[PDB]
Amino acid sequence: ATCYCRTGRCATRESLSGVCEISGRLYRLCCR
Structure with a gap:
């Protein structure tokens, strides 16, 4: 996938x- x-x-x-x-910060792992 391509993930951000x-x-x-x-x-x-x-x-x-x-x-x-x-x-120290949380992010969404967004994949397509």
Whole structure:
């Protein structure tokens, strides 16, 4: 997949696949 760690919600063609921890903050792992 192509995945991004997002501060906001996933794009509509993406799926929330997990979460990322980066420098003490949580992000959505958004994959398409």
